[PDB]
Amino acid sequence: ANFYVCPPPTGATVVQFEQPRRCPTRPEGQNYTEGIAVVFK
């Protein structure tokens, strides 16, 4: 609860919003090959 008093602004300080970023893209995804297998011990 602290009040504020503010002088009228001037062009001394200029600021702008950021431009949009580029969003990351999904990974390609692993390329899986089907098959039938036998495991020997």
Binding site: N2, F3, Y4, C6, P8, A12, V15, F17, P20, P27
Partner: protein, 220 residues
Amino acid sequence: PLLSNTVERIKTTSSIEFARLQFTYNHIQRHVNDMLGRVAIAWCELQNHELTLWNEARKLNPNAIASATVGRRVSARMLGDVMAVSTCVPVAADNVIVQNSMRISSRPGACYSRPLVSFRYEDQGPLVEGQLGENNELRLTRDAIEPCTVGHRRYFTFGGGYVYFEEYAYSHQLSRADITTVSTFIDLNITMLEDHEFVPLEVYTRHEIKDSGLLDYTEV
């Protein structure tokens, strides 16, 4: 491999737990990475999408937007396609006095739409007249004037609470809790995973397996 129409002796380990652990880890990792990448993509898109609303909010009320974006309480004015900004100074709560009446004693039919205030910069400074503002801010020029209308009840921010004005006359102060609040936040509840402990557990120990034999040559 299948496609849709569209000299040395090898030693094998006795335990296969590593492969099962690898499968579990890979499955969990794939799921969490996919989902969290999707969430990151959605966050980036949402922020890029909300920039559009900000582009207009900077026009509707430059002071609030400058205060929330720059990082400190400042006053700004739009000066083309940019904002001219200025850092402005605090004033103690106890050094502010509100005048009882907002009525203009010299001009009937014109009433101040905001409460008139008297503030001093320091505890021993001179008295300065001015106009109250929004979110506890002080305006030096008294320009907010409107035609006087019957049925005038108003609330205004003051310190940590409100001041309520009846018929262009001082009525009383109110605590913040005195007025019911509607929620402007969407709730999101996350709880962490609890820490767990795995104890040594075996179906059969070495000694039980050794004892399973009917005769032992060594003991005999």
